Amino acid sequence: SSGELWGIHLMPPRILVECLLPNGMIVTLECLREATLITIKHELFKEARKYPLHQLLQDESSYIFVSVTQEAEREEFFDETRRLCDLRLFQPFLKVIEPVGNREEKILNREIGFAIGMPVCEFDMVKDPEVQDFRRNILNVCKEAVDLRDLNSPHSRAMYVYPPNVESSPELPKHIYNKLDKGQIIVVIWVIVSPNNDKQKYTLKINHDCVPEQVIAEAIRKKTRSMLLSSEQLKLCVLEYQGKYILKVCGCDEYFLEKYPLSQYKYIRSCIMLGRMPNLMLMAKESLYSQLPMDCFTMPSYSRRISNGETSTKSLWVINSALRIKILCATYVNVNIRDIDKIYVRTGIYHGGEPLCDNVNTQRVPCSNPRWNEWLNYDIYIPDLPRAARLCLSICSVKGRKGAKEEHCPLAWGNINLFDYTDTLVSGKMALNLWPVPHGLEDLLNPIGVTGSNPNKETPCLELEFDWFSSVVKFPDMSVIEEHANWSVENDKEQLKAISTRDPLSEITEQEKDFLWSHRHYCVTIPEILPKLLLSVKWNSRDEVAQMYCLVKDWPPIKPEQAMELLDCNYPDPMVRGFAVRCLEKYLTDDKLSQYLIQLVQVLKYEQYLDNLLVRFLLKKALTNQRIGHFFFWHLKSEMHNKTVSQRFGLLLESYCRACGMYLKHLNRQVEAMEKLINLTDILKQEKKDETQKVQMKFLVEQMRRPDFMDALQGFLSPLNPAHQLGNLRLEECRIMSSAKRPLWLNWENPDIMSELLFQNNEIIFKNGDDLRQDMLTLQIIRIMENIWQNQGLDLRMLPYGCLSIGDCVGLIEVVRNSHTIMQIQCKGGQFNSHTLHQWLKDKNKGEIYDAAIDLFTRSCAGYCVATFILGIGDRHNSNIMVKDDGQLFHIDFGHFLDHKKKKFGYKRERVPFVLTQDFLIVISKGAQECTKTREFERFQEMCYKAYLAIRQHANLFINLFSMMLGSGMPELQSFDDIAYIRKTLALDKTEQEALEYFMKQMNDAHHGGW
Amino acid sequence: NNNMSLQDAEWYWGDISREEVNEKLRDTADGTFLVRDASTKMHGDYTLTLRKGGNNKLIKIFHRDGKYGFSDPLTFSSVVELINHYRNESLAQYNPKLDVKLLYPVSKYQQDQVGKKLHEYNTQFQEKSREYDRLYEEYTRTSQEIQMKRTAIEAFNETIKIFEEQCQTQERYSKEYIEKFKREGNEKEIQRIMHNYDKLKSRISEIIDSRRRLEEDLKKQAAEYREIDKRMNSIKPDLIQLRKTRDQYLMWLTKKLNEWL
């Protein structure tokens, strides 16, 4: 039944399902797709008495079905309401074995496994103690979050389900303060909407800094003035109604639960910024409290497993021996015999990215006999080993022919954590399944990759023998380190500031490192110098690492956007990352956390253990906020196709879905809808490459005429925005594009009762086969830069539309209202004159709003020119630029966000992708034969210069974000040499004055203007 | 040594970025030094890239009052003289960071062995580049299909395990209907209990046949997937080595050189 692993896509008229029977017989029953398990049981027991041995039959509801699903797992189908199609049956057979355990816990386990995408019995059947310990210990933070969710219920539960979308800072920028009449907002309030049809609208002239309590007070004082004039005491009796009303964004699922300034809410601030009237509505608080479901959380079955010891281990700092690792043998290397001559194993002790010792290699051996049995020697002492040390090694091949110049190439890489999660040094025999080398990688070793063996057993494996020191060796406690601490015993203030001001990726010299370490005590006065200080210390010692631990212990907290750098791959130490997590806990707001949730998810791969402080912080934040939890689940699910991070992300998703509450129903509905869409796109792709659009249209309407697809594609929250509800699916507008990669356009409807004034149709483009992760990163950067410009005082508003990846090369793209590509602009109305776009904007709107459209166009152009020059996005053709009707334009296809074309067609491109076309000059200059000397173009230059200077001043954040996204796996983001492009484009090394000169020279080279 | 000019030095490279230095100083033995200029673009910057302990170390060279030196005091007249002295010595006067000696220069002259001799090398690059991606494209397809088939035998293994127990449920209950229903025989349902028995037994024969067919059906492309890895690794170093061919052909020229191809 569907899946197309061993079966076929499920389209039978009537499907045959075979049935067993506990007495030892088999029953053949033909049924329909829509039949339920009870329905199957009816004809099962109708013929059970017809068959012999009917006396052994028990009662009708005396036992439960069981069968085998497509995930090669045995499922006890306790839910009797499931239809015959969605059972994911691998073989059309059924069995009954009678129930043996708790029904609700296995129902919950099935829901968790479906939302995850793989059954949790895989997490049950693992012999690794770390996985079981993580699953046992993460329920502590799960239970703490669940208990926090009911502190002052029903208020806290409402805050969890509908968290307030608030701007990060209560302060309001100057460019939008002047859009209010004496600092006041006009809001429209819809009240008492009911079957009585007494819909009313009230316009309230209220200040920007008001609270929803004041808003409902004004609303009820304006509503009560019509029904009664009041005798100046009747109006005072409204003190019992302020607790009975809750604001809601009209046409959306956003409630104003928390007491905040109204201008701090993102909906109100957006309405102020774009100029639309903020339209809210009132409702009874009892309705909101009754509509939310009961929140339940029960401890799972795998807990309560708690009921080896010799000489109480030994401290690692008492060893007086070097480090020896024996390379025993490789089971196989999959390389040609006659072509490739010899192979060898290259190893090396690493800490983050920098090695702690010189790399050593085994003797080169032919492929036929991959046996070494050699004790590799490293020039690092055992006590010199840091806590976060790792053994990075790989199997490499050498081609020493054609006149020397050996062509060393990697075959398979791997990393071993030198310390267990229980602080114990690695000892004894060990076998590692080597990972495949990633595509387009040059280095011999892979220290950026995650540790652990390959779960796949058709991969090369190497046998590692570690030295044994007569007992298990444990890393010393913090008390021993503190005992070793303190045992070691001007114009320099400006130099520390100069070091702190530069970007984290700048050049650091040996004298700078020595100066930083010699002034490590004075560095407390500048808390921002911590990353430079951590690069200054060398971790292949003991006393200085103890000293740095002592310094980090008393280090003052720093900015979230600065301590968030301390979580990337360069800093693997548990103390440093714990300090960064403490800074994030005490300083990062929930809104900024949702801003950088994607990077915080992607830096979970650099963690060397599953159970640590960052994952607990992220889970505690996700379980107390459904807006954060939605994107937490989707970001963890989008990377589950990757086998290299499947296990830890799966365990995290299992914990989350165990304690996420009643959001499992909505997440499962989203999973069902997106899985049906993936199946439809796969069927239409693999089979209809050479069919005209009429054939795909008729096949799509036939597939969407089916009852199951309709029943699965209504009434679920949009994954792009959980507040938006995707109700009825109108098939009139759903269509297939011109088949770039066969994108799917889908139109839904708002099920909200008060939604006619807002948009009634929700459009999302479904793209399968295109990697959307670079687009999400580009749009996040666009959003952050736009926020920086709006905070600074520049009204350079752009359009970072929604884009989310939900799986392997598949995802959703938000569609905006009334936008036409410049291809579509010149397609109609006339071999195109230079005045085409300006005339089109004149025709679309004229009069007093012509100037607003023109200056909105100029500001959008300035913002996007600066953005695409700085980021170096792929070459902006005239088909990737779409302009709205009101004037604002935007870009859509961010294929490569860091050029990625500098290696091919030459070596140094450094190009400007988005150059001002002559039509853009004409429309920006309001239409003229000349464009350059126009003073409006001088204003455009001023906008571009100010935007570039602001981004250059804030470039540290973007560099940190790219360094955090480094380990995700995008092809153009694989090393810091990729981030060197964004470092060079902003000209961090040059000073502030000549960086603007470089920007001006580039912008003149693009425009061919001497200026 | 001699009063040799700064620009034409064997070890010196001008206007070379950090990434070129990092890729050139790869898998390199200890003591290798490289002199370049900083990206800060002031005159007399002269960063020195000494690779010790597996990672490159940057050492700044100062230009105070026409004299050179890593740190105060400065007593070196020429940076060429400074590098020659540090090749003679082993960094003993500075901090004893293993006291390595400048031994292996990164020479642009000790290598190898105008528009006409460049078009022929560009044509052969594209044909082999697509083949390596062609092998990788079906490498992903086969690997994903193997995993889809690897779990299939596991799925069949459960069904065999379910049905093998199911026939045992009949067998453990076979003894009770041996005689009391064979009392009648001809018109009694004992003609059906074996008829029911062979129905399921024939069914498990097909599943164990399909599992047996899938047992060797999986290994046919698995060796091919093994062979594709053999074929892909037999071409991987050539792609890496043909990339370096631009290193010896972008000199002596630096127009539309990037456009001619």
- DSSP secondary structure of A451-462: -S--S-SSS-EE
Candidates B15, B156, B229: best to mutate against A (most CBs of A within 10 A) is B229
Assess whether the previous peptide bond of A556 is cis (omega < 30° from 0).
no
Query: Within 10 Å of residue A620's Cβ, how many Cβ atoms?
Result: 16
Indicate yes or no: CB of A990 within 8 angstroms of CB of B26: no
Q: Strands A279-284 and A245-249, how do they pair?
A: antiparallel
Q: Find the residue in B nearest to A536 (Cα).
A: B57
Contacts of A397 in chain B (CB under 8 A): 233, 237
Question: Is A806 strand, coil or helix?
Answer: strand
Contacts of B132 in chain A (CB under 8 A): none
Cα end-to-end distance, chain A, whole Å = 69
Indicate yes or no: CB of B17 within 8 angstroms of CB of A980: yes
Gap sites in chain A (C to N > 2.5 Å), preceding residue numbers: 307, 489, 830
Residue A280's beta-bridge partner residues? Answer: A189, A249
Calpha distance A758→A250 (Å, rounded): 7
Contacts of A52 in chain B (CB under 8 A): 177, 181, 189, 192-193, 196
Which DSSP category does A118 fall into? S
Which DSSP category does A426 fall into? P
Candidates A70, A343, A507, A975: best to mutate against B (most CBs of B within 10 A) is A507
A402 vs A365, A406, A853, CA distance in Å? Answer: 19, 9, 67
* Residue B192 forms contact with A (CB below 8 Å): yes
Q: Find the residue in B nearest to A361 (Cα).
A: B27
Indicate yes or no: CB of A335 within 8 angstroms of CB of B60: no
Residue A323's beta-bridge partner residues? Answer: A378
Phi, psi angles (nearest 5°) of residue A511: -65, -35
* Residue B195 forms contact with A (CB below 8 Å): no
- Determination technique for this PDB entry? cryo-EM
Give me the sign of the Cα torsion angle A934, A940, A942, A944: negative
Calpha distance B17→B20 (Å, rounded): 6
Least CB-CB distance to A68: which of B155, B166, B199?
B155
* Residue B139 forms contact with A (CB below 8 Å): no
Indicate yes or no: CB of A25 within 8 angstroms of CB of B57: no
Of the candidates B205, B210, B162, B144, the one whose C-alpha atom is nearest the C-alpha of residue A73 is B162
Question: Is A746 strand, coil or helix?
Answer: strand
Indicate yes or no: CB of A23 within 8 angstroms of CB of B170: yes
A355 vs A388, A390, A975, B101, CA distance in Å? Answer: 12, 9, 16, 20
Calpha distance A137→A143 (Å, rounded): 10
| Class of the domain covering B116-246 | mainly alpha
A565 vs A573, A580, A916, A962, A964, CA distance in Å? Answer: 13, 8, 35, 10, 7
Contact A367, A394 (CB under 8 A): no
Candidates A25, A349, A434, A911: best to mutate against B (most CBs of B within 10 A) is A25
Contact A928, A922 (CB under 8 A): yes
Largest CA distance in chain A: 106
Architecture of domain B18-113: 2-Layer Sandwich (3.30)
Q: Which 99-138 residues of chain B touch chain A by CB within 8 A?
A: 113, 136
Helix (H) and strand (E) counts in chain A: 33, 32
Question: Is A356 strand, coil or helix?
Answer: coil
Contacts of A980 in chain B (CB under 8 A): 17-19
Of the candidates A582, A571, A585, A566, the one whose C-alpha atom is nearest the C-alpha of residue A528 is A566
Calpha distance A597→A636 (Å, rounded): 11
Q: Which 32-51 residues of chain B touch chain A by CB within 8 A?
A: 38-41, 47
Contact A320, A337 (CB under 8 A): no
Distance from CA of B59 to the nearest CA of A (A): 5
Candidates B166, B258, B261: best to mutate against A (most CBs of A within 10 A) is B166
Cα A704 off chain centre by = 30
Structure tokens at B137: 């494209």
Indicate yes or no: CB of B47 within 8 angstroms of CB of A507: yes
Calpha distance A791→A954 (Å, rounded): 12
Calpha distance A337→A409 (Å, rounded): 15
Indicate yes or no: CB of B233 within 8 angstroms of CB of A444: no
Phi, psi angles (nearest 5°) of residue A995: -65, -40
Query: Within 10 Å of residue A189's Cβ, how many Cβ atoms?
Result: 23
What is the interface size between A and B, counted as CB pairs within 8 Å?
151
Instruction: Say which residue the tokens 């190497």 belong to.
Output: A462
Candidates A26, A332, A349: best to mutate against B (most CBs of B within 10 A) is A26
In a 13 Å sphere around the CA of B9, the CA atoms on its Cβ side amount to 24
Distance from CA of B8 to the nearest CA of A (A): 24
Of the candidates B12, B63, B13, B17, the one whose C-alpha atom is nearest the C-alpha of residue B40 is B17
b/e burial code for range A687-697 (CB count within 10 A of at least 16 → b): ebeeeeeeebe
* Alpha helices per DSSP H over A929-975: 935-953, 955-965
Candidates A338, A458, A502, A540: best to mutate against B (most CBs of B within 10 A) is A458
Q: Find the residue in A nearest to B222 (Cα).
A: A458
Question: Is A472 strand, coil or helix?
Answer: coil
Cα B45 off chain centre by = 36
B48 vs A41, A176, A258, A509, CA distance in Å? Answer: 81, 52, 58, 9
Calpha distance A795→A857 (Å, rounded): 12
Tell me the residue length of chain A: 1011
Q: Which 203-232 residues of chain B touch chain A by CB within 8 A?
A: 203, 207, 222, 225-226, 229-230
Question: Is A720 strand, coil or helix?
Answer: coil
Determine the residue type at A125: M
Distance from CA of A807 to the nearest CA of B (A): 15
Contact B177, B191 (CB under 8 A): no
Residue A132 burial (10 A CB sphere; 0-12, 13-18, 19+): middle
Least CB-CB distance to B19: which of A26, A355, A977?
A977
The radius of gyration computed from the CA coordinates of chain B, to the nearest angstrom, equals 37
What ranges do the domains of chain B cover? 18-113, 116-246
* Residue B60 forms contact with A (CB below 8 Å): yes
Question: Is A630 strand, coil or helix?
Answer: helix
Q: Find the residue in B nearest to A24 (Cα).
A: B170
Calpha distance A109→A88 (Å, rounded): 16
Indicate yes or no: CB of B158 within 8 angstroms of CB of A74: yes
Q: Find the residue in B nearest to A403 (Cα).
A: B113
A834 vs A845, A850, A918, CA distance in Å? Answer: 19, 19, 7
Q: Find the residue in A nearest to B210 (Cα).
A: A6
Of the candidates A422, A448, A454, the one whose C-alpha atom is nearest the C-alpha of residue A134 is A422
Residue A666 burial (10 A CB sphere; 0-12, 13-18, 19+): middle
- DSSP secondary structure of B58-104: EE--B-GGG-BBSSSSP-BS-HHHHHHHHHHS-S-SS--STT----E
